[PDB]
Symmetry: C3
């Protein structure tokens, strides 16, 4: 439905935001190794 589409998009946006933060966390660990 249209309402399910709206909720699906919101859930997709929240998943991306979580992935962006996970990537930032991995970057921090990788930079610690790269400059260790």
């Amino acid at each position: 439905e249209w309402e399910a589409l709206e909720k699906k998009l919101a859930a997709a946006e929240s998943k991306c935001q979580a992935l962006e933060k996970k990537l930032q966390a991995l970057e921090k660990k990788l930079e610690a190794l790269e400059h260790g």
Copy 2:
């Protein structure tokens, strides 16, 4: 169109799922280095 919007959202969701798995794979390699 509406139908193109539905397909675009499904394709976007599948791309995210693939990125989540790629990030998990990179995390595994980074953890091997971090604890090596």
Copy 3:
């Protein structure tokens, strides 16, 4: 609205594309360490 939904999906797709490229950049640094 419907038009806001279309724009929200486009913005979400562009965020994912940027994350895919960021992940590729982190992979390159991790591979340099993994084979160093």
